[PDB]
Design a protein around this nucleic acid. Structure first.
Lengths: 185, 257, 171
RNA sequence: AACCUGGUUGAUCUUGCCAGUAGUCAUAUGCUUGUCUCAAAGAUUAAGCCAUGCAAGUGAAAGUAUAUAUAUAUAUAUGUAGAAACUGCGAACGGCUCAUUAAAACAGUUAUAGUCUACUUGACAUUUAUAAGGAUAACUACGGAAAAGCUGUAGCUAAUACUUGCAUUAUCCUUUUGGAUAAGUAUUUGUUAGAAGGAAUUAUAACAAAGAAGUAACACGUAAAGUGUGUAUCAAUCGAGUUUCUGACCUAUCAGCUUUUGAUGUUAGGGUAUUGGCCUAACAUGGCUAUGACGGGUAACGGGGAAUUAGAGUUCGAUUCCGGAGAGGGAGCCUGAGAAAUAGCUACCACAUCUAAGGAAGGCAGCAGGCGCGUAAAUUACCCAAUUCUAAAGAAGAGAGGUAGUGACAAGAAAUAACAAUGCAAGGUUUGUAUUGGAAUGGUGGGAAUUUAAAACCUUCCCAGAGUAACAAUUGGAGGGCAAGUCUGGUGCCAGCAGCCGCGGUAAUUCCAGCUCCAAUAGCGUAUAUUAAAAUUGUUGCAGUUAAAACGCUCGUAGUUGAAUUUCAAAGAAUCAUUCUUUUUAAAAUCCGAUUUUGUUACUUUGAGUAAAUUAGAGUGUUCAAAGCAAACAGUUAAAGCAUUGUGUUUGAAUACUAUAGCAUGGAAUAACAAAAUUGAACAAGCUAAAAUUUUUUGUUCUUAUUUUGGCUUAGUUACGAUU
RNA sequence: AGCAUUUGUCUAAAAUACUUCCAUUAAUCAAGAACGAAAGUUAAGGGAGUGAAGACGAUCAGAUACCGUCGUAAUCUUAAC
RNA sequence: GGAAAAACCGUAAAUCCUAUCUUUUAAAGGAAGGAGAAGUCGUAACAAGGUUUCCGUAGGUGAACCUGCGGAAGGAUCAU
RNA sequence: ACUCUCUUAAGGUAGCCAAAUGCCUCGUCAUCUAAUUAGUGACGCGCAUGAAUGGAUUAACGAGAUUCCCACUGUCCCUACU
RNA sequence: ACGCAGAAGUCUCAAAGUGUCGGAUUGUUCACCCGCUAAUAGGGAACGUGAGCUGGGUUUAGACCGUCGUGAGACAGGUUAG
């Protein structure tokens, strides 16, 4: 038999791929948020579209329906946990209200830049890829990691990194500098 | 050519079991015995997948080969032996007694039963036959013959039944106002009291059941099991007691703990 | 055996599909004749045994008026309802009319009533004459090819008249 | 993402196509591939063929050991292991393919009161006796054949192989007690009597005949009176055969089909495990057909489902689950509970192997691998550790199953730097960006910890270890469609490019190079298939004066469509001139002045009974994500909880879709239909033939009559009886 | 489709009028059928005029055409198609 | 009791003969249709295209076509 | 094809074929066979086909001319006996 | 004898002792194939062989088509019947 493990596509490019306005806005999104691909925007678009579809299903359904109140409460709880919704944002028109910069803002590279751990989003991306961050004492190398609302206070540099002072990373080079200086002196 | 199919695949096997997708190619296929395939648990599932007293099928075999576990006062090493809807398992070595009950999530659960109260079970009859000499035998949900039963008892009655002597302690006439457990159908794994009986002619008999939240629903007669009386529940149910919370209520209740 | 190879309900024709199975089932007809008892056991599906009588002479015949049964030789096969071939060739079936030896029944009637439990209502004169002359007509009722024995009942009145007329321009 | 641009012209609006454009667990191919996790993988073409290997066996309380090994006791006794072999049980599952098969198989939905069912489970038996009767294998010997899973004699000897066979209950008398008499489960026949199911020729009870099989001559061992193996019947269970209803792609350049010859009914038989023209005889002369029969086609296994879906839809379903079919073609059997089995057999045909040429044996659409076919597809790997299966069932087996190897099928994640200086750029002392120079980092090479059936991968740690970080990113475009050049040479309707419009015939923005720019990116081209696009097949939702299209004209059967008409209303209460809800207002039947019922269907409402995977969708920080079905919580190496220091705790593994048909189910509207005047029916009265009640003589039989009930004939009487 | 003299006969038709009758009988209709110009076919008449074919004269670059003159089949009726 | 062997019904492979249907597939030769190059001969159609046009039809033509007969304007007339 | 021409009156149209009609010729191509001066269907610059001198095509019909296949056989192998 | 290695094979002498076929097509000598074979040699006998046969052809009178001939008719032209 075949593996019963699932798999799913994360992206698509809408028809008219040379839509000028769409292209220019996406380029500005890449530039601003330190993305590597249009595919990064497309995954965020898929998440937003999933949100829009859910929100449409909820708002089309009436008040006092079991599916509607269960799914709506569950979605709002989850969106609050992800940190998409504000304090009094607890109604379906705010779920529709969500925008692509806000989803991008939940990314770890954006947060690392925001906290001032790195001096740029792209710098933050490389900092994260080079294994120097920790979230709640867990190292993560993923720049597209989406930070939960509770998690935001718990983001710092890895204690097992050279930045965390455990050892220099280039022991060889640091040793060479010490050895050469001691030999000459 | 053609004949008896001896295997049961993972996906094909009952959802009630909780046998996960990645966890194997097959499930155990039950031996013929106390209950129907869809309406039972084998000892392998009970020891490993419910109780978790063994890591593997081999560790289950190491438990079973020994004389330690006895069901119905009978020692069993038989891995795929089926234990049915309701009966008493005793594990001598750990000094443990379990009574089998339906969960509200429609799966079989082992509910801890008192050491004295392990003596008896409550047993539904499915049919009652007159054999040579006009001499009764009752036939039970758990596939047992109970010979020589008094004619007061009828074909849907439940009976409290000793396990040492195998015979009747008391009996409960099937009627409106009797506490009932649903064993199959839409309303599977819930308990209610019989609100009303209406005969259906030549076709499925339907029975109206009331919940303990004072809510009324229909169920087919074949798959309702009398389980107590309006005066008292006759056996030790788990804490949930077959009572239906809706998903929103249940998740809010879970959160508010 | 199979019916799926036969014509469709419309009168239409259906292609041959599914190669022949064991359990469609059907075997050669019984040939049971008059002669000393000889039978073959036949093994049916599930180990279910049938007894194929190949020859018999003495069956279990019932005098149904007193409801009593004795084992008696059949003298001859005389009429068959299904076809004339089987009676002429002498092959028993459950609607053959045979002739039985009347002597066990005649003894029993004599013992019970004292002239020739019990109803004691007196046998009809035509039938009684037939019992006296030993030419007693009886109808086979068991299936010898299935059960290994040809057992029957003594005929009377309307059944007797009907079968007598059936048995024999002209009259 | 409920959508469009470019192309008929000198210019225009349309019809209409073509072209772009996006998707596809859908295939191939081109170029490129520093990585990691994940994982489709000889179906489409030949249901074509296969070299070699392996894929089904089985002995740890309980049949058989003088091959043998071994520990005790007086060669011998107990015992314990034991090659082998009889015996027992399994190999009917699984794995594989989809040629078929188009009302069949299959799906939902019945029925089996028409039946069979091993293992397992629970009930539980009736017509030589200190314990039986031998005979047979392995084994010993001689042998035969080129070869073979060829086998010949004779001597033995066991079984849980095979064959026999050994006092119990109820009724009648006595009266508790003491005597007497009987005594067949399935199954079949003939006669009856008649717990439950809607329904009975069922359970069951009696009679008279037959009648299987049977009910242990087997093996272990509980004192800090037990067990195994195996047995008739009954029921359960694992199932299975039939069988009801409803549901299908294309075709009329297929309109009448079926019946010698079972077609269709009936009767009688026979057969079968059982119903059955399943099979035979006899008798009818039917049966089926536009609501498309009967043929013919299909690149046709059926379903759960897959793709695209705003909504309809449209395309697709060899292929992970289920059901069927099939094992070279047909056919026929044996064995067994189960097979018309095909690592069962036999024959024929189609193939085809070894032969010493006398003869012998054979079946990859099991797993590898090979051939042929082709545009097209991986290793003769390792393992039973997990998952399960088979046994004398723990410990053995299993190409089932797992693990690797090959894998740019698909899917997720993710590099190819970051940074500070100067120099440069713009902006008022800022932001943006060719030189230098220190930190950080994986890939790559190694050792461990670890992971593991074992090995490999992963992770962790430690060594090694980038400056042109040469540790080197590609593809296709840049006139329009359409995001990017009135850039440089060369070619000169040539070469060529270009889905399409077009460019090229001498100062080429389209070719060939080069340069720069642009798009997507470890992926991107190309082709074929398929969906959107397409309200260009149109139920929603098209078009038919002139663009494509009203039959020349009319009638007419099937078909679809078919006017009004029948019980209106009133008041209250709840609630924000609104809204949801309750009560009463003719007549007949029925029960204790009151109480409770009153056409059928379509349509509709609730329901019952629904396999998972998938799908929607909740719970759940896989390191995130694709995912999975788990997890979370406290505690340096403990308290709490509950038990008289033992014992972690909270759990989760949701919810729903799950035909249209069928089943139950409330219904007022709207539809249908039935009820419905060449005179009909509702009632009272009388006459009348039938049955029963009450009466009533004749001893285990038996008369007659009044009376009471149902059926039928006739004069009256109703608010009596026809909508426009 | 098609239908123009006179008079008569056999027939049908629509509207109007109706305090006349019926009481849903209807609408549009695959299948099938009816009627269906012109020409053509086949048979009898008739063959006036017109006149496919055909024939000449021209015309003209050629003309087998337009134009001129002649002219069979056909046009007409009856009977079939 | 019982091997080989025969005989009888019944399954019934296979083979061959026809009969009808299905599918590709061969074949000398015939006769069409299209594509291409600014090909030959006319001058047919497009304007009254120099005989208004088209339709049905029949007969003729080296053709393009022409003529007759009966329709229509899609006529150049919607006007005594 | 189209145009012109000499000769002669007009210069072969529809068709048709190596035919009972093609000298050369046993023409060339298929097919039938085992081998085809034969048979057939074609082709057709036709010594010298052809339109009432009738051309073309035909079912029914034939003591017709001709080819081939089946059946049948002493025609024949190859004769023998009566 | 050889340009004859063997095996083939060729030229050749004494040699007529012995053999020299089955069919397809033809009116046919001749011819032209296919097959076997040892090779399928060539010739004479009144063109071997009609009171031996056969009568298919050339070659009587009937008939047919073509050409040629005004015609009757002709035709080492074809064809059917004798």
């Amino acid at each position: 038999p075949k593996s019963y493990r699932n798999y799913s596509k994360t992206a698509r490019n809408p028809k008219r791929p040379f839509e000028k306005e769409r292209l220019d806005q996406e380029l500005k999104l890449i530039g601003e948020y330190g993305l590597k691909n249009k595919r990064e925007i497309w995954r965020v678009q898929y998440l937003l579209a999933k949100i829009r579809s859910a929100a449409r299903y909820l708002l089309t359904l009436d008040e006092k329906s079991s599916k509607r109140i269960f799914q709506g409460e569950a979605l709002l709880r989850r969106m609050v946990r992800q940190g998409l919704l504000g304090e009094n944002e607890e109604k379906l028109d705010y779920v529709l209200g969500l925008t692509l910069p806000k989803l991008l803002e939940r990314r770890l590279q954006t947060k690392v830049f925001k906290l001032g751990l790195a001096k740029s989003v792209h710098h933050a991306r490389v900092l994260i890829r080079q294994r120097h961050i920790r979230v709640g004492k867990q190292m993560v190398d993923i720049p597209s990691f989406l930070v939960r609302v509770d998690s935001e206070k718990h983001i710092d540099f890895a204690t097992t990194s050279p930045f965390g002072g455990a050892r220099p990373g280039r022991v060889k080079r640091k040793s060479l500098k010490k050895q050469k200086e001691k030999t000459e002196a | 050519g053609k004949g008896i199919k001896k295997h049961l695949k993972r996906v094909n096997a009952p959802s009630h079991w909780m046998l996960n997708k990645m966890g194997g190619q097959y499930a155990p296929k039950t031996s013929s015995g106390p209950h129907k395939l869809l309406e039972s648990i084998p000892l392998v599932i009970l020891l490993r997948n419910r109780l978790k007293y063994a890591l593997t099928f081999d560790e289950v075999k190491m438990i079973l080969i020994q004389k330690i576990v006895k069901v119905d006062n009978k020692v069993r090493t038989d891995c795929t032996f089926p234990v049915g809807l309701m009966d008493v398992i005793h594990i001598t070595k750990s000094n443990e007694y379990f009574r089998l009950l339906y969960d509200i999530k429609g799966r079989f659960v082992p509910h801890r039963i008192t050491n004295e109260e392990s003596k008896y079970k409550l047993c539904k009859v499915k049919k009652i036959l007159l054999r040579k000499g006009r001499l009764s035998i009752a036939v039970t949900h758990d596939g047992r013959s109970i010979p020589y039963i008094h004619p007061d008892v009828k074909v849907n009655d439940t009976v409290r039944l000793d396990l040492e002597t195998g015979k009747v302690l008391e009996h409960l006439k099937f009627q409106v106002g009797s506490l009932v457990m649903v064993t199959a159908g839409h309303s599977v794994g819930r308990v209610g009291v019989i609100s009303s009986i209406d005969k259906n002619m030549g076709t499925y008999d339907i029975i109206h059941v009331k919940d303990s939240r004072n809510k009324v629903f229909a169920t087919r007669l074949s798959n309702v099991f009398v389980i107590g009386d309006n005066t008292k529940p006759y056996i030790s149910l788990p804490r949930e007691k077959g009572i239906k919370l809706d998903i929103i209520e249940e998740r809010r209740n879970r959160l508010k703990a | 055996r199979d019916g799926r190879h036969k014509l469709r309900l419309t009168g239409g024709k259906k292609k041959i599909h599914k190669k022949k199975r064991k359990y469609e089932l059907g075997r050669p007809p019984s040939n049971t004749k008059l002669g000393s008892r000889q039978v073959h056991v036949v093994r049916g599906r599930g180990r279910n045994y049938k007894y194929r009588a190949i020859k018999l002479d003495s069956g279990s015949f019932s005098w149904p008026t007193f409801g009593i049964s004795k084992n008696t030789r059949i003298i001859d096969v005389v009429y068959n309802a299904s076809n004339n071939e089987l009676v002429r060739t002498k092959t028993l079936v459950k609607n053959c009319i045979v002739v039985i030896d009347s002597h066990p029944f005649t003894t029993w009637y004599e013992n019970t009533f004292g002239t020739t439990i019990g109803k004691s209502k007196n046998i009809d004169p035509l039938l009684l004459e037939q019992f006296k002359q030993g030419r007693v007509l009886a109808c086979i009722s068991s299936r010898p090819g299935q059960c290994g024995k040809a057992d029957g009942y003594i005929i009377e009145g309307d059944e007797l008249l009907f079968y007598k007329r059936k048995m024999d321009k002209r009259n």
